[PDB]
Each structure stands twice: as structure tokens, then as C-alpha cells.
């Protein structure tokens, strides 16, 4: 780790010792360096993958400081190998240029669904800038330029910023505070040149989709989500799989729901089952039947669901929106099952006590939550009733919890959680407002 | 009026011919006189500027206004024109002085706040004001650089003799036909202040305009008291006055006028308050139960009766109540008011009388007396037994109406059939997908 680097340190010292001169097979030390360099570049790729998945709501508690430290350490080994000292010279100098180019990274990625005529930010950071730049020579200027997928295989304003040192900051960065721009993918190339003969630095951003406000971004959001999720580390720019495993998809979705909604309760296997039924148009109640399936892009955002007028992602993002705006605390409190069929509800609820209810998302509309519940009398015969789905607007007028209370028929949330636990003069006759079922 | 001006313009010609003798230099050249005639015209204009200011102040409470300064400007322009000829005519030192006085007072009277600053002001909130110089086209321009005008905030004491973004040029617009200073975003970072606008040009002269009075509140709302202070001052000032004196007591007739205009401007409506309303209002303020409008006609109001004395049996003042119906109506009820579906101002007691001879399901809408910003339904219910009961349903607030509108609530109630007198509710107010429909509904007890 740092242990291997420890080796590299020990060797320089020896060749230093072996320098009197009062054989040079030690410069397999250059190889030992080269190996260490490839190694870092690998870590740098790993961090980018991590950052790409964070675009989708993955946990990214990764600082770039560790990668910097290591990079600086390798340069220190290089300088020593250089000062000590044929052909190896080309070699080390090759180590250096490689490292330097790999050290220029986008650190704050820009909005990946980006609207025109809207203010945006990105930032690029150079890991080795605290070895090669600084005060004597003027800071190199980093440009921002939008590019097509075609160009990246090789309109923005406020696109130039100096790449600057912070000794307090312990970094070299250029941050664009004030950027504005005036299915189809593109990127921002960030560009700077510097001599330490002059080298040109390029960072390519994560892919973007540019939209003009309204209408807007459901499609664009699906695209970013697919690319972020299913991308290959070493891909040719903006190429993704068309089909992916459903298990990978389910994951991607759980992370998404958590991020958007704002909750740490995710989706279960039981949720994935009802999801899978919908995406695949299947009714098996076995998680086994859906565990090793493949998903395509079409199934996800292109083929409209059976008996519906929307896609699967349109539906899913519809529930995200709804949950995020109205339902977030209810979802955290585990008051909503949410993803369950009307059909399976009937099975769960038929044997239950009168007044037992559950909360699901509407299968048939976008952004809907409905009440399903069991009604049974003294004859003992159960009937299930499904109350029409509520929307975001309906939920503004009166909240879900209020509506649940308004109803005397409703007694316990499944399974047996009392509705009251679970949910939070002068001569005038009282009037009240209650939700009412016909 | 203008007649005078023609007559002046004629006499000034008369002197020109006369001066051809052909020296008078020191019918008979008692012919100024023409100069007194000028001074008088000047007094008339000063009076007109004054009248205009009163109008603008009244508009502050929702009075009609719609007046332009352009006529006043032409009137000033003409007067300068006479002064100038008269001056030219003098080529007797009284006269040059007297005439030099005429010009002085007119120019100084000429500087005005055309667009007033907001009368209730918040700190760190941004606002607009405008000043205009009526004689600027004559006296500023091409040789000079435009005078800079200052915006300062002054006290009442200071005004008898903190804002930033506050210096603006006083420039002529030839297409604009005016000389004006516009302050687009001034920022400010029982108590009355004003904005003093200050310029100096040489012709030096110092130009001063003082705004209408302002109350600054530091958030830390309310702004109820501030608004009352501002309303009374605008209403009940004298043209005469010193900053910023107001009367303590005024006529209720005058108050009623004030309220009516306010209710319209503020609410967004052209339907005002009737005498039937004013009666009920009089009862509240004066705490008197007379049902004759005559009882209240020569009555007078004080500032105290208006915003300082807590209404009897209540926790609130009269203005506090009035301003409360205002907010409730502006927010929720404006169309309903316009459509005339609200009686509004009527007592619970008077309601029993109107309704008790009416048919079943007949109703009205009133503002609640016991609350701030409330609207209630009163209605008559009569069975086959034929005995009437009046039911007053508890009042609704603004919050309540946002949830379900008042029209929706009225509709919700099968008992309510016709709005008084005899307007059908319906005119006035106007499984699947195997889910069972749900609605919000309002229920009575
Ligand atoms: Ni109208």
C-alpha cells in the first residue's frame, strides 16, 4: 500500500548509497515506480466510477486527498530518480506526463440534466498542482467548452478561470461559480496547458443532456440514470449497455428512491417483485422467477406499459415526485407499503379485522397513493374497498394523515397498527371538513 | 384660470409698444401692475400644485386620482415666459427683485415627488420613488451636467427643520417631456418619517422635496398600527400643515368615505360600502345599538375610537377588525363580493329579523363580529311544523377557504337552497378503474 511505496523509498536511498563513485540494475526501480503509477491510475478510475454512481444517489464519501498524497509521493520518487541519473530518462519523463494528465479531474460535476439559460457550476482540480505550479509562474487558465459525443471521441459564458493553489486548502483547483449556457448526450471539456515544454490538460465531464425548460426532463433523467448506472469504466465516450441485469437495476432504483425522496428506507425484495411484474408484464408471485432476468432500455423508458399510457420510468419517477413532495415522513415511519398490487392486497386483507388498511401507490395513474381496506360486518363476510388514489394536489388540500382520520371506518393500519398511533361559543354551530367516501 | 394668462400675455405686448418712446428708464407705465398680475398667477399655480398633492395623498388611500403633472408644467412654462419678457422689458430695482422673487418661488415649488415611496416601509426591502422638476426643460440641459439628486430619510422633527442606492441624475427627456429623477431600487437599512429629495442647481438654488409620511416597521410585525397611522394622515390632513400634524377627531361621514375607498382599492373591487353597511359599522365603533342612521350622522370619530380602544367584549380594536375583513376579502372573497353574494356588514341580531320570515334553506353571508377575518353563514330552517329556527354556522377563515372554497362549502350543504333574497344557490355559486370516489365535504352538526 504505502508499504509498497516504502519499498520505493528504500531503493532510492540505496542507489543513492551506491553512488560512490568514490550495477545500475537498480533501475528496475523505475519499473517498481511504473507499477505504482499504473496502480494509482487505477484508483483514479475507481474514484470516477464511484463518482458516476453517486450521480444516481450512491454514497460517495470519498475525498480526493488520499489520491493526491499518493501522487505527490510518487513524484518525489521520480525527482530523485531523475536527479540521480540513458533511455530510462524517457521512461521516467513518461511516468510524469502520464501521471500529470491523469491528475486533472472534474471534482464537482455539473448538472447532468442541464437547462439552457440557467446558472451552473463545475470544478476541476489538479492533484499535482502543489508541486508544479504556484507563485513564480502565473497560474494556467482553465477553459470550459461544451462538446458533442462525436467530439469527445475526438455556448457557455464565464468559461475561463485560473487554476489556483491554496496552501490552506491543500489543493489546486479551478472552480466555475458562474457558468451559464446558451436523450442526446454531451459533455463539458475542461482544458488547460502548462509547462513544468508545455503539456495540455483535459478533463471530460460526465455526460449531460441539455433541455429547454417546459416541457422538460423525464426522458433526460432516464438517460442520465442509465448511463450512470450501467456504464463501463473504460468506455468509449458515452456508450452504454442496452440490456442490463434486473438485479443491477433494482439496486439502482433503491438508491434513487432514497436520494430523491430523501429517506433511508429503501425498497425491499417484496417491492422488486411487484416492480418486476410491471416491467416484464408477468404475474408470478415468485421472486425466483425474476431474479435472473435481463432489462433493456426499451422496457425501462421506451415501451409503454400494458393498459397504460406511460412508461415504467414515467411511473416510477411519478412515485418519486409524489413521495418526495407529500409522503416522505410517512414513508420513513413505515406506514406505506407502496409497491403492492391490487390483487395481492385482496389476499392480504381478506382475513383481516374490520377496518384494517394499507397504503399503496396507484398502478393506473401517475403520482398516486390509494387506500385499500377491509370492511366486514356481523355476518362476517369481508369486502375489500379501494379508495381512489390521491395526488399531490389533493394532498395539499388535506394531508394523507388527516384524510385517514376523517374516516371512522379506518381503524388499524396493517397489520394492526392503530391509526391514531401511526398517524400524528360564541353561538355558532360547528362545521367540519372531512374526507368522504361515496 | 387661463383667462388671466391671456390677459397677461396681452399686456406684456402693450408695454413693448409703450416702451417705444423710444428710455422710460428709471397707461403711464403703471403697467406693472402687469407684474402683480404675474404674482397672482403664480399664487394660483402654487395653489394648484397644492391641490394636486392633496389628491395624491388621498390616492394613498384609494381615491381616484388619475391626474397628470403635464398641465401644471405648461402652466409653469408660460409663466416663466412672461417673467422673461417682463425682464427683458426692464431693459425699477424693486421690480427686478420682485420678478426675481416670482421666479424663485416657482422653481422651488416646482420640485415634487411624482411617484411616492411606499408609506409602510420595511427595512432592507427595496423601493421606488420619483421626483420631477417641472421647470427643468427651460433651465437645464445642454451646457450643463445634470444635477444629482439626493435621497435621505428624515424625521418629523428634522422635517420641520440609511438609504443606499440613492443618488440619481436629474435629466431631461425630450420625448418624455419632463425632467425627472427616478430611483429604481432604494434600500432602507405612531412614528412618521419621510424621504427628502435634495438637489442644487444654479440658474445656486437648493431644491427640496419631502415625501409623504412613512412608517418603518422592523418586520417584527405587525403592520396593523402602521397602516392605520398612514390611513388617518392621508385622509385627515390639512393642506396647511406642518410635518406631520393630523387631527384627533374627525367626522364619521368623512371616515365612512375613507373606509369605502379603502375597501375598494385594497380588496380589488368597484363595489363599495353602502349606508346599510355604515350603520353596522357605526354601531361597533360607537358601541351603540341605534338602528337609525340618523343617530350616527353628526357623530365624530377619534383616533382612539379608531385604533386604540379595544372594542367592547372583544380583544381587538375597530381597525384591527376592519383590516381583518379586508385581508379576508382580498384573499378569498373578491369575486363573491363583486357578484354581490355577501351582505357583509350586518349584525347577528339584525339577521334574525330578516331571515325569520323567509323560506327554508334561505341564507346569507356575513362577516364575523367575534373574530378577525371570518366569514359565516346564517340561515333559516323551517319544517312542516312551520316553526323557524335561525342557525349561524361558525365562521370561516382564510386558511379554511384555501382548503375548500366558500362556494364549495355552500354547495356541500343540502340544507342551503337559496341566497337571500331568493337567489338559487346554483346560479349564484357556479368501479372504474375500480376505485371508490372520495371527496372533501363540509359538515354541520
Ligand atoms: Ni367589479
Description:
The structure is a homodimer. Chain A has 438 residues and is of the alpha+beta class. Chain A folds into 3 domains: 2-102; 105-227, STAT transcription factor, DNA-binding domain (Immunoglobulin-like); 243-422, SHC Adaptor Protein. Chain A has helices at residues 2-17, 29-53, 65-83, 88-101, 129-132, 149-152, 218-230, 246-261, 269-280, 297-302, 312-332, 342-349, 392-397, 400-405, 419-422, and strands at residues 104-108, 113-115, 119-126, 141-148, 156-157, 160-162, 164-166, 171-181, 185-195, 198-204, 208-211, 243-245, 294-296, 356-361, 369-376, 382-386, 412-413, 417-418, 431-437. In chain A, the strands form 4 sheets. In chain A, strands 2, 4, 6, 9, 10 and 11 form a 6-stranded mixed β-sheet that branches. In chain A, strands 1, 3, 5, 7 and 8 form a 5-stranded antiparallel β-sheet that branches. In chain A, helix 1 (2-17) runs antiparallel to helix 2 (29-53) and helix 1 (2-17) runs parallel beside helix 3 (65-83). The longest helix of chain A is centred in the first third of the chain and has 25 residues, at 29-53. In chain A, 31% of the residues are buried. The interface between A and B is medium-sized, with 25 and 27 residues. Strand 19 (431-437) of chain A pairs antiparallel with strand 19 of chain B. Residues 269-271, 338 of chain B line the site of nickel (II) ion. The site of nickel (II) ion has 4 residues of chain B, from loops.
